[PDB]
Design an enzyme around this catalytic site. Sequence first.
Site, PDB file in Angstrom:
ATOM      1  N   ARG A  25       0.824  -1.208   0.000  1.00 54.67           N
ATOM      2  CA  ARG A  25       0.000   0.000   0.000  1.00 54.67           C
ATOM      3  C   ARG A  25       0.857   1.256   0.000  1.00 54.67           C
ATOM      4  O   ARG A  25       0.522   2.247  -0.665  1.00 54.67           O
ATOM      5  CB  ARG A  25      -0.941   0.017   1.214  1.00 54.67           C
ATOM      6  CG  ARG A  25      -2.032  -1.039   1.192  1.00 54.67           C
ATOM      7  CD  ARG A  25      -2.770  -1.062  -0.149  1.00 54.67           C
ATOM      8  NE  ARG A  25      -3.799  -2.102  -0.189  1.00 54.67           N
ATOM      9  CZ  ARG A  25      -3.552  -3.353  -0.545  1.00 54.67           C
ATOM     10  NH1 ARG A  25      -2.315  -3.775  -0.756  1.00 54.67           N
ATOM     11  NH2 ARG A  25      -4.566  -4.202  -0.701  1.00 54.67           N
ATOM     12  N   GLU A  29       2.061   1.657  -3.378  1.00 54.06           N
ATOM     13  CA  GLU A  29       0.958   2.186  -4.154  1.00 54.06           C
ATOM     14  C   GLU A  29       0.813   3.693  -3.961  1.00 54.06           C
ATOM     15  O   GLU A  29       0.573   4.419  -4.929  1.00 54.06           O
ATOM     16  CB  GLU A  29      -0.331   1.466  -3.790  1.00 54.06           C
ATOM     17  CG  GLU A  29      -1.482   1.898  -4.659  1.00 54.06           C
ATOM     18  CD  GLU A  29      -2.633   0.922  -4.563  1.00 54.06           C
ATOM     19  OE1 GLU A  29      -2.641  -0.043  -5.363  1.00 54.06           O
ATOM     20  OE2 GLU A  29      -3.491   1.086  -3.656  1.00 54.06           O
ATOM     21  N   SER A  42      14.856  14.596   2.193  1.00 54.88           N
ATOM     22  CA  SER A  42      15.812  13.584   2.603  1.00 54.88           C
ATOM     23  C   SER A  42      15.104  12.410   3.265  1.00 54.88           C
ATOM     24  O   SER A  42      14.103  12.571   3.966  1.00 54.88           O
ATOM     25  CB  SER A  42      16.835  14.184   3.569  1.00 54.88           C
ATOM     26  OG  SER A  42      17.749  13.201   4.020  1.00 54.88           O
TER      27      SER A  42
END
Lengths: 156, 156, 156, 156, 156, 156, 156, 156, 156, 156
Positions: free
Chosen positions: C96, C99, C122
């Site tokens: 996820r 995603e 960063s």
Amino acid sequence: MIQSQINRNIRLDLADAILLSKAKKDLSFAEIADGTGLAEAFVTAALLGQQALPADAARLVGAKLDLDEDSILLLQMIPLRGCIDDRIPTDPTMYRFYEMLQVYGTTLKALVHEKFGDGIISAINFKLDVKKVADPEGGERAVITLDGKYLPTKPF
Amino acid sequence: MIQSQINRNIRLDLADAILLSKAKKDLSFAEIADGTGLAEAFVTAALLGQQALPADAARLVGAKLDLDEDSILLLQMIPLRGCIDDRIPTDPTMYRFYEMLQVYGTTLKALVHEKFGDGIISAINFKLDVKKVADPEGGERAVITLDGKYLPTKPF
Amino acid sequence: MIQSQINRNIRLDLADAILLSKAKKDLSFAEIADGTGLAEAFVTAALLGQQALPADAARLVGAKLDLDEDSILLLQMIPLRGCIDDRIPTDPTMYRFYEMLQVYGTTLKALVHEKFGDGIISAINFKLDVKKVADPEGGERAVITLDGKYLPTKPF
Amino acid sequence: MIQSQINRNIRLDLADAILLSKAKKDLSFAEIADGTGLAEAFVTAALLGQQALPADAARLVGAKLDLDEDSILLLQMIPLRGCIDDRIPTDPTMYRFYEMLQVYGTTLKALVHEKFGDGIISAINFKLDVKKVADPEGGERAVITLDGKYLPTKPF
Amino acid sequence: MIQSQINRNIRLDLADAILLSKAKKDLSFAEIADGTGLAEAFVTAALLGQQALPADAARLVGAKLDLDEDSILLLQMIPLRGCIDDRIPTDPTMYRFYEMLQVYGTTLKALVHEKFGDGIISAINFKLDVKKVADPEGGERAVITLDGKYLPTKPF
Amino acid sequence: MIQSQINRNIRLDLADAILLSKAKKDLSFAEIADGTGLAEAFVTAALLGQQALPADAARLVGAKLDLDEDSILLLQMIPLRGCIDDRIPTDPTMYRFYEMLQVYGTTLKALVHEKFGDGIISAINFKLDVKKVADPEGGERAVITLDGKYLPTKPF
Amino acid sequence: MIQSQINRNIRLDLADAILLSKAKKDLSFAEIADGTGLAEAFVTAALLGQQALPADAARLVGAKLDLDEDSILLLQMIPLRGCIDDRIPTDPTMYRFYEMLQVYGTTLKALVHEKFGDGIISAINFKLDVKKVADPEGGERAVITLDGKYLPTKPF
Amino acid sequence: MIQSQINRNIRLDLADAILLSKAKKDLSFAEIADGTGLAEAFVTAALLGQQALPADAARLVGAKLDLDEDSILLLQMIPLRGCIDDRIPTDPTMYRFYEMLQVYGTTLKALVHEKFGDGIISAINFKLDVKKVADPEGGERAVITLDGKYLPTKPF
Amino acid sequence: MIQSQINRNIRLDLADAILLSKAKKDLSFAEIADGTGLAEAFVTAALLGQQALPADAARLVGAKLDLDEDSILLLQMIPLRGCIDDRIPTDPTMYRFYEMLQVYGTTLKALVHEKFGDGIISAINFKLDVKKVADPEGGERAVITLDGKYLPTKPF
Amino acid sequence: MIQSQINRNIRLDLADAILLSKAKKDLSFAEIADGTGLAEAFVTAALLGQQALPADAARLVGAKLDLDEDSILLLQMIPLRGCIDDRIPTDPTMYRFYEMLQVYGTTLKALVHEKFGDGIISAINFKLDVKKVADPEGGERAVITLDGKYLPTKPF
């Protein structure tokens, strides 16, 4: 300054056009970068799609190469960076620099952690230059200097 | 030395054991290389499986690290080089050097051909140095010098 | 400190051992990090092979998990980081987050360049935390805060 | 609205044209999103091909960018989502968010399971926003909030 | 010659056009290379995008092939080399040479280290020759001579 | 010989043991092959797992290397050939032979078709020789001879 | 229950041991699931490393399979999910479900968006059932029911 | 119908044209399939490049979508199937069905072999159907029925 | 037989043990398959991990190779099929059958659709055998017969 | 014929044009091949980019398909062969032949080495044909005959 690209192909297509114009005019990157105030590696990298030129440098190099307005604009956009076609270079000249990573990559890691500590040597806060020196044994050598900031990993 | 390896895993497994021994003795790579007459980057690369040590250096580093005869032998063998697990590093420290290639790979190519001509900068006739310098804006910088022989493409 | 790993498998194996001890002892990561003075995400990441613990925290978590001296030492060594097996996670929970990169990655890039400029957020000078909150529609939400330093690209 | 795409290139090519128009008009994403009632990340994601805009928002952003009827219709269609060219970003700015997963992916999994249980944090029932905050050591930081519904795994 | 390409597609597209004109004019590569002063393999490689031709040879092959001014210029530019589409050839004729690598790659390494030492056989300071000889058992054999400079790895 | 392997690791693991024994005995591949009647490249390939040795050569090299009965038997089995770990070599010495393919692969195809016709040069009906010659420029060269049967493609 | 795995190999290795034990006792998955109160696909998936069993179910199936205490514990931990070795199944039986995706994946997307709207069919709030039914034309058919919650994409 | 395609791009390009026309006409896939005598999933798949329409259906949907003769003919061609761009979907909606295989792939294999035997569930002799049902917990669910013929592996 | 494997390495490891036993006993696959009532290709495939043997055949081939009870059991289990290490064979012998696909794969598709119609030639309802025949031009030829059921794609 | 191609897209684009022309004329491959003296699989392969046609057959099939003069020339050129888009076919019809390789690839290797010895079945000195036969249990079968010369591995 706030405009950015999401598709490297637009700036790489522009780079191809720049290189043909550059070759037709028999220009060197040194002379395209001259008068720009920026190092030849940075200007070259911008022409090749990997940096953004400040508007002043963009106009100047645009004039040397007979670039149209959109191209000069494009050179100022923050690029989607990534100059290798498919992760590993096929070109011998570029491959050699990948090969130094395959030979010395863990050594660079080990010596960075030994000399600096946990963290990274930056590729962003970073300069490079390429220097030609004579080889005492004959021929020529490239002295390429990678100058990156050390950023420590800090716990929290 | 005419003995060479064909499977990097043997020297890499040795590297892992060397690193544990090294950590237990709280040794630095600088320390391990001292007395060998070889640059710390070369000695480090050899410990990490990417170079062969001459017999005298191998004996001396083997003494410091408490290595057995077989490990000392393996350090002398010409390795199957390639320190990256699967082509692209996952380690941030290692990755930054790959990213320098993704950003500047074509620039290095362009400038090599401009300054030297058609050909390569060698990764073989090649020297690597890592210096720590102060950053005048605060913090520290790594100055990594790549020193490679230029070899021209020979038309025939 | 000065000691680093070059093979992630050593610390990932240690991580598996840590997880079994943790489950047998019915410990939460929150419990383990308690008293280290370090955030649960940092301590967890170190246990899972992605950070180095300072010696005092290593000894303390080693006490809680009944680790041996080598393991406590391995937890202090700077890791070869990279927790994803093969570049793209298979695990739905981890996927996820990948995603979100596939849906928002170019948005994050666009909005970083718009709000900060050319450069990076960063992952090194970086904090994260995970908070459980009520969902007004029923159920619960995770609020994950990524707190990363902005590093600008500057020309040279 | 019931209409959807199966080839991301259409919306991504549209995104390239949008980005040129946007750069020529010197628009920010914040400006484009203002007045839609939608968050800047959601509108930006839609322009970049990763979300559908409601008809009213599509008209509005289409007006601000001089988009034609077909482009405005395209912005309303449910996209074939996936903004990364080839799984792993090459661009340093987007790469850092992938690196965040390479370092913390398993920590995020571990803590989600600890705080919530077996399940996922949604990328679909999801909000993100990007906040610039000052860094007390100097410079700026990005506070990126990922706010996802927790969806438990239902045994059956 | 200081002009170089960064995108192999330009020279590879030219190669396609060269091959069509070559087929229409019923020319062989040996005939194209005649009068050039260069070996047929070197000239052929240049036509196929993998070498740069000197200006006089470029003009001569351009006369034989009825190439335009821009094509003759592109032939002189230093290429982005890499003739294999996606790392491993699909074409049986090219695949066989990859198969010799898969069968003899480690043997070549072993024998180079035995006969020369640590180092490489150059692909740059390199000539190749293809000879047709009679097979004593009937039919024909190719005798392909790879003539590469040995470059030692040197400790430093 | 009708026994064949389906998994290269067995013979490649054997190769590793052979190489260690060979190093301890300070043997060259030339010496190992002496008395077999087989070319050094063929015997080396067999040791490295890429060819089968006839029984008598297997016993002879097995005596020289003090191999056990199962190892001598394995050397006679037809191998699952493929000496490259993962398609593209990482090792510089072997990489250069892949690079020759990236530079000259289509040239070899073109010249094979010109000199011989539609078909292939065999890697199976094949012999290779590695010869060291003085370079008039100084240093040494490898003259590697690939000698492969031409097999035409014929219509049906 | 708050304990989770980060390395699929532990549970997959456990699955292999379970399958051998299951084969030796000639048990079916239906028998193993019987009495757990859970669906056969859920229990099966748990045994194969892809679900967590509740403690009662775990002890029940562990009694049926003579699993040790550690193995029963492992079955209760939340897995690192991902049952396909390397992204694309090689097994014909598993591959057909992938092919279903290659043939109908975009149709499923289109029809989900038509019938439900922008969003996903959940793989988490999800039940699956495999029924055997007679084919009237002879033979049998599998009626595989995928029963997933529709979760809409939420603007914000 | 004996005409078949070998390059999926032709029919996928056509699918994109169809989807634009469909969106302009505000057609549903249900509407387009109405009166063809074919299930909406089959007609949808054909439009999306993954099935051939019989000529009568092709003429019917072509009328509804205002397709030219060549397009109507292309819809009748047997396609080169494969709707996923690069093996793994990036689209969340399509990805969930891949995740279903990553979680339950081995369970499907296991239960197919348990209920049916050695062999496959066909993706060819195959019906799929998508139903919307109410969720007792609120909201909606997709009941996706995969109805595949079992084909045994039989010894020979 | 309802027991199935999910990890091919179990049966492939067994195949390696079988092959060493087979070589030690100098058995052929023809001899091993003799008396099983199954084609040599089917029994060979089962030994090599790609088919399940019936209990009687498994006992028989197990006796010939002195396999233990567990191994005989494993041979009866429905395998996780897939004999290629990493998608594309490296072995020349196996590669040729892949090359046959690279040259004739689209021809096979074209001719299947022309002769049979939309659908597939089954790899499940399928037989193969390998016949040695004399080449009238000298030497030998393999006639490999692929015999697969045609299954049509039928609309619904 | 000494002219050869290096880029498979030229002949594959041409194949797409041929297929459209073929479909408009509702020609089969059998009738296109009729009168060439060449097998339907060979002519089909040539049309699909995988073989060269002799001049006479090229002019004949070109008359049947209304091919221009350049297309007829292209069909005579020796192709860059490789018909699979990306190594593994997605098309179910083509995939089944790859699956045969995944199930029987090692069986084919084993049986070839058993029946012929160390070497290869050629894909070059090679014939295939596709025969339709009735299945006794109903429906049809494809009998695909692969007829390749055995070439022994030659020691030296």
